[PDB]
From Swiss-Prot:
<comment type="similarity">
    <text>Belongs to the conotoxin T superfamily.</text>
</comment>
<feature type="disulfide bond" description="globular isomer; alternate">
    <location>
        <begin position="3"/>
        <end position="9"/>
    </location>
</feature>
<feature type="disulfide bond" description="beaded isomer; alternate">
    <location>
        <begin position="3"/>
        <end position="4"/>
    </location>
</feature>
<comment type="function">
    <text>Chi-conotoxins inhibit the neuronal noradrenaline transporter (NET/SLC6A2). Of the 3 native isomers, only the isomer with a ribbon disulfide configuration shows pharmacological activity and 3D structure similar to other chi-conotoxins. This ribbon isomer (disulfide pattern: C1-C4 and C2-C3) inhibits the rat norepinephrine transporter (IC(50)=10 uM). In contrast, the globular isomer of PnID shows more than ten times less activity against this transporter and the beaded isomer does not display any measurable biological activity.</text>
</comment>
<feature type="disulfide bond" description="ribbon isomer; alternate">
    <location>
        <begin position="4"/>
        <end position="9"/>
    </location>
</feature>
<feature type="disulfide bond" description="globular isomer; alternate">
    <location>
        <begin position="4"/>
        <end position="12"/>
    </location>
</feature>
<feature type="disulfide bond" description="beaded isomer; alternate">
    <location>
        <begin position="9"/>
        <end position="12"/>
    </location>
</feature>
<protein>
    <recommendedName>
        <fullName>Chi-conotoxin PnID</fullName>
    </recommendedName>
</protein>
<feature type="modified residue" description="Cysteine amide">
    <location>
        <position position="12"/>
    </location>
</feature>
<feature type="disulfide bond" description="ribbon isomer; alternate">
    <location>
        <begin position="3"/>
        <end position="12"/>
    </location>
</feature>
Length: 12
């Protein structure tokens, strides 16, 4: 999944 967060990966 594409992570937009560095501290926490959230699928965009």
């Amino acid at each position: 999944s594409t992570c937009c967060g560095y501290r926490m990966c959230v699928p965009c």
